[PDB]
């Protein structure tokens, strides 16, 4: 409930800090004047997240990184079970033999997204294996809120928050560290008796409006890890790059700059491929000796279908033996149960009648929600119950005490928040070489938000 | 000259880096939507400046800071012989009225010396600013922009085109913030309290300020590097939110009880900054408080053009500076003017007018320029020559190898550059407590921010 003028002053303080710190994005049709940018949509205050849930999300990221790395490794062998059609087509095309040894190292830059269910437990709503965004702006919104607290902007008399509870993410720096690590492992594969300064190629979308989020990684790579980079669209890839047919190494025509890492910030949706040449550009990159982040299989490993398959204890067990790690993951999954007499089905029926409010009954015509479940099933013979499945419902913690700033307008409405956990993993055909937690993100609905632990 | 495509790519690199780093400013009428900002006008490449000239400029700043501090102290003594200006002096006289409390004797000068590189190389001061000097913050950013473009292979995909050792990277944003923090601590150090005290810096700003991002760098450095908070107030805010404790004169913000240790002006140096009698009253209210002003009325007045000219005279200068060496160094930077009569400097003037005419301009105290002087003086009479004055002209080194970026339009025109040197000085009635060089600036025009490459 900020005073109307307390709020107005607070809003301009946000605009001034954000612009001064590049917490920005290009508005539509920025191509008409690329020297103008706007403040990114953000909340004014941090959103409360339970400390216990946050620590578990952070702690479990390495286990998810490893899981998807193992799934990717398994998929590289048609002797297992694990838009997607074209991607798969490109994959098969990379199987074609070449005269140079192919690049075995892959870089996975991921992000796990959770909802804080309070039917507190984190529930995974998504695991992203390709082109994850906002690692750069996340750091800035966190620092914006921290500053507003420490500079007495939230309250002229003093901080209204305990700095020890305000999360400040280093995702921008950590993602750049992951890219620098991939470049060094590329260089380390073969030394030179000449200077070698391979770079990171950012493959971007034409007319990218969120470039400033990406620029943070480019600048950290340079200033912190001495690594240079270039921004290329599928057009630029087709026009400016070439492959040494003897080594498969990727270079930029005329300049001779060598590309060690192909970092995708586009290519995760059917419209990212505007023409057939764009598909050929992707294939061309995947075939090169450069380390892809991510390569085709890694991207495919994140298919919603596979995510669904992994919610099955039996399937999960095939990739994770440890009982402890297995239970930590399943705990975060949205549970689904059949209503037959199989082992799981008996559990389903027991839950449907003992804790109905936690679920929704969906047909395999209408769904039946929560407290209406028992009565509904009572009117159907138990033998026909398997005509439906029981699905766990997520009831997120709504924040009613926050203000969303967008285009200089403030909105004081209820918001739901999604917790994002970045993760980075470097792996080859059979082993994981590097596995790390890479920062956090919080988005409400959309806009960037920050975390306050309680 | 970069190829058309090499330039468009470089322009895109500039916009991206600049926005990501806040090297920005509000466009006209930003009031409509303050959530949008544009890239500040800047050059694409750094401008060449003689290392010798740059070092002399840096080295003499402390001498200039001290000269103007002494002038101010001299002006502060009553028995001392030493329209907008009249109004300022008017306010000053008002501060002379007694009070229940002991007046604040410490003042902070945040100055900036501006020089042209005369190639007749010698630095020639064209201006000395004693109030609300700008660009200390964006200055650091344009320097880092150019360094980035060089080190990240944007100027040339094959490698840097400049020796990083010759690229000046100013810390003026940080140094100006340190000067302010320094003023805050000396304010706090005047009298202790057994209980935590955290006075702030008050930025007095212009209404609808478009160059706020340059100023924000100072605000952020103060907090992050010196743990000092601050507030942005227009003269309207000063009148509505501040109040003075009659027993101590101390300045406070109503209701919050936050104490203001330093009043830092980023407005109030030109007549249009005062939109009404109320604004003038706000200035006086601030000047009478116990807070340390940056700068106070008298320091501001020491920067008037008359005084600056009064100083170009070796006689008046010698009053505030003994050391022949310090004096000679200062005089070298001033634009010389000569009398054309039968005195000491007179014969020297005539000699110069006929020996090196191309270096001066003759003016009646129509101007007769350069190579035309001996002729003009020949047809007249020496005894009558006294009806003129010989002034040396500054023929600055033009840079024709740069590109200026403004509102996404690039200009490849020759440019003249002005080298700015920031300086901070803390002083009381008779002594100088702190005197530092505080960073550099390079502004160019056919205006925009530029950076320095030494040679």
How far is B29 from chain A, CA to nearest CA, in Å? 14
Longest dimension (CA), chain B: 80
Which among A15, A35, A152 has CB closest to B15? A35
Tokens representing B31 are 């009031």
CATH of B337-393, one of 3.30.1490.50, 1.20.1440.230, 3.40.50.1360, 3.30.1370.160: 3.30.1490.50
User: How far, in Å, CA of A359 to CA of A393, rounded?
Assistant: 5
Angle (nearest 5°) at CA A407 between A404 and A411: 30
Neighbours of A8 (CB within 10 A): 12
> How far, CA to CA in Å, does B143 sit from each of A35, B27, B39, B156, B171?
19, 22, 15, 18, 9
- For the structural domain made of A3-47+140-168+403-413, what CATH number should be given? 3.30.1490.80
- Give B218's contacts in chain A (Cβ within 8 Å): none
- The verdict on a CB contact (< 8 Å) between A151 and B27 is no
**A97-to-A86, A94, A419, B72 alpha-carbon distances in Å:** 20, 8, 43, 83
∠ Cα B228 B232 B236 (to 5°):
145
CB B260 within 8 A of CB B212: no
Query: At residue B81, what are phi and psi to the nearest 5 degrees?
Result: -70, -25
Please tell me the distance from the alpha carbon of residue A212 to that of residue B19, in angstroms, as a whole number. Answer: 8
In whole angstroms, what is the distance from residue B31 CA to residue B151 CA?
38
Contact predicate B79/B21, CB 8 Å: no
Chain position carrying tokens 């160094």: B329
CA torsion B224→B226→B229→B235, rounded to 10°?
A: -110
Runs of H (alpha helix) within A39-160: 51-75, 84-94, 135-150
Q: In chain A, where does the domain assigned CATH 3.40.50.1760 lie?
A: 169-302
- With residues binned 3-state (H G I as helix, E B as strand, rest as coil), the percentages for chain A, rounded to 5, are 40, 25, 35
Bridge partners (DSSP) of residue B259 are B252
CB A404 within 8 A of CB A444: yes
B20/A16 CB distance under 8 A: no
CA B352 vs. chain centroid, Å, equals 33
* Residue B223 to residue A21, Cβ atoms within 8 A: no
DSSP B77: S
Backbone φ/ψ region at B407: left (φ over 0), alpha (ψ -120 to 50), beta: left
Distance CA B120, CA B349 (A): 17
Which part of chain A is CATH 3.30.1490.80?
3-47+140-168+403-413
How far, in Å, CA of A340 to CA of A358, rounded?
A: 19
Determine whether the annotation assigns residue A363 to a binding site: yes
Cross-strand pairs, A229? A200
Query: How many other CB atoms are found less than 10 A from the CB of residue A91?
Result: 18
Could you tell me where the beta strands, DSSP code E, fall in A169-307?
Answer: 199-204, 229-232, 241-243, 250-252, 258-265, 291-293
3-state class (DSSP) for residue B455: coil
Say yes or no: A196 contacts chain B, CB-CB below 8 A: no
Indicate the residue of B148, B152, B258 with minimum beta-carbon distance to A156.
B258
State both tokens at B156. 């040339």
CA distance B249 to B236: 20
* B223/A252 CB distance under 8 A: no
Closest CA to A328 of A315, A336, A316, A318: A316
Pairing of strands B200-205, B259-266: parallel
Architecture of domain B60-98+304-336: Orthogonal Bundle (1.10)
Domain with CATH 3.30.1490.50 in chain B: 337-393
Chain A contacts in chain B segment 243-282 (CB below 8 A): 253, 255-258
3-state secondary structure (DSSP) of residue A415: strand
Bond into B295 cis (ω within 30):
yes
Nearest residue of B to residue A231, measured between CA atoms: B13
Q: Give the CATH number of domain B170-303; options: 3.40.50.1760, 2.40.10.230, 3.40.449.10, 3.40.50.720.
A: 3.40.50.1760
Element (H, E) at A267: none
Specify the domain boundaries for CATH 3.30.1490.50 within chain A.
Answer: 336-393
For chain B, residues classed under CATH 1.10.1080.10 are 60-98+304-336
Tokens of B387: 């009806």
Nearest to residue B283, comparing CAs of B263, B302, B261? Answer: B263
Q: What phi and psi, each to the nearest 5 degrees, are found at residue B187? A: -60, -50
Cα(B19)–Cα(A219) distance, integer angstroms: 13
Q: Which of A153, A45, A15, A7 is nearest to B200 (CA)?
A: A153
Per the annotation, does B133 bind a ligand? yes
Q: Which CATH number among 3.30.1490.80, 3.30.1360.120, 3.30.43.10, 3.90.226.10 corresponds to the domain B3-47+141-169+403-413? A: 3.30.1490.80
Angle subtended at Cα B435 by Cα B430 and Cα B438, rounded to the nearest 5 degrees: 150
CATH second-level architecture of B48-59+101-140+414-455?
2-Layer Sandwich (3.30)
Residue A33, chain B, CB below 8 Å: the answer is yes
CATH number belonging to the domain at A169-302, selected among 2.40.420.20, 1.10.10.10, 3.40.50.1760, 2.30.110.10: 3.40.50.1760
A247 exposure class (CB count in 10 Å sphere: 0-12, 13-18, 19+): middle
A209 appears as a binding residue in the annotation: yes
Residue A151 with chain B: CB contacts under 8 Å: 223, 229-230
What class is the A48-59+101-139+414-454 domain?
Answer: alpha beta
- Report helix, strand or coil for A442: strand
CB A394 within 8 A of CB A334: yes
Q: Which chain B residue lies closest to A222 (C-alpha atoms)?
A: B152
Q: Which two tokens stand for residue A162?
A: 């305990």
Provide the greatest CA pair distance for chain A: 80
Q: Of the candidates B35, B258, B407, which has its C-beta nearest A408's C-beta?
A: B35
- The verdict on whether residue B356 carries a ligand-binding annotation is no
Tokens of A396: 């997120």
**Distance from the Cα of residue A433 to its chain's centroid:** 21
Q: Which region holds residue A134: left if phi is over 0, alpha if psi is between -120 and 50, else beta? A: left
Q: What is the CATH number of domain A336-393?
A: 3.30.1490.50
Work out how many CB contacts closer than 8 A connect A with B.
95
CB nearest A212 (choices: B20, B151, B220): B20
CA-closest candidate to residue B218, choices B161, B137, B325: B137
- Taking the C-alpha atoms of residue B47 and residue B12, their distance in angstroms, rounded to an integer, is 20
CATH of domain A60-98+303-335: 1.10.1080.10
d(CA B126, CA B114) in angstroms, rounded, equals 6
Listed in sequence order, the DSSP H helices in B77-153 are 84-95, 136-151
- What count of other Cβ atoms lies within 10 Å of the Cβ of residue B191? 8
Residues ≥6 apart with Cβ < 8 Å to B455 = B48, B49, B50, B51, B166
Residues on chain B touching A229 (C-beta within 8 angstroms): 152
In chain A, ranges of CATH 1.10.1080.10 domains? 60-98+303-335
Count Cβ atoms within 10 A of the Cβ of residue A366 and give its class: 0-12 exposed, 13-18 middle, 19 or more buried.
Answer: exposed
Closest among A379, A49, A21, A74 to A219, alpha carbons compared: A21
Measured between CA atoms, the residue of chain B closest to residue A20 is B22
């Amino acid at each position: 409930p900020p005073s109307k003028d307390q709020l107005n002053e607070l809003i301009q303080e946000v605009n001034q800090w954000a612009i001064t710190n590049g917490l920005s994005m290009y508005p539509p049709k920025f191509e008409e004047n690329p020297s103008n940018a706007s403040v990114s949509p953000v909340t004014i205050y941090p959103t409360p997240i339970p400390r216990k849930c946050f620590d578990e999300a952070v702690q479990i990221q390495p286990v998810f990184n490893e899981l998807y790395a193992r799934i990717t490794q398994d998929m590289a062998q048609p002797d297992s079970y694990l838009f997607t059609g074209k991607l798969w087509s490109l994959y098969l095309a990379t199987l074609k033999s070449a005269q140079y040894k192919k690049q075995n190292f892959r870089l996975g830059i991921f992000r796990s997204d959770y909802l804080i269910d309070k039917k507190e437990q984190i529930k995974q709503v998504e695991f992203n294996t390709v082109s994850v965004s906002f690692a750069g702006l996340s750091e800035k919104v966190d620092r914006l809120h921290s500053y507003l607290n420490r500079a007495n902007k939230y309250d002229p008399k003093g901080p209204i928050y305990n700095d020890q509870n305000m999360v400040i993410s280093d995702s921008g720096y950590l993602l750049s560290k992951a890219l620098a690590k991939a470049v060094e492992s590329y260089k380390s594969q073969q030394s030179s008796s000449t200077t070698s300064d391979p770079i990171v190629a950012f493959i971007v979308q034409r007319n990218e409006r969120n470039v400033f989020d990406q620029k943070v990684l480019e600048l950290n790579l340079l200033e912190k890890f001495g690594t240079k980079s270039v921004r290329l669209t599928f057009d630029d890839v087709n026009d400016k790059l070439f492959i040494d047919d003897k080594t498969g190494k990727l270079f930029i025509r005329d300049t001779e700059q060598e590309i060690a890492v192909v970092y995708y910030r586009t290519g995760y949706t059917t419209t990212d491929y505007t023409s057939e040449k764009d598909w050929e550009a992707r294939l061309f990159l995947e075939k090169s000796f450069a380390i892809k982040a991510p390569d085709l299989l890694t991207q495919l490993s994140g298919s919603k279908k596979i995510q669904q398959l992994l919610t099955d204890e039996g399937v999960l067990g095939k990739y994770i033996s440890d009982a402890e790690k297995k239970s930590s993951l399943l705990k975060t999954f949205v549970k689904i149960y059949p209503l037959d007499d199989t082992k799981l089905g008996r559990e389903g029926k027991r839950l449907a009648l003992s804790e109905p409010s936690k679920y929704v009954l969906k047909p395999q015509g209408n769904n039946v929600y929560k407290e209406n479940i028992p009565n509904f099933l009572k009117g159907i013979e138990e033998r026909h119950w398997d005509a439906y499945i029981l699905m766990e419902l997520i009831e997120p913690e709504l924040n009613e005490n926050n203000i969303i700033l967008r285009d200089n307008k403030s909105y004081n409405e209820p918001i739901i928040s999604e917790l994002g956990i970045y993760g980075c993993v470097l792996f080859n055909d059979e082993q994981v070489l590097s596995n790390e937690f890479s920062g956090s993100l919080l988005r409400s609905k959309g806009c960037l938000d920050s975390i306050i632990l309680y």
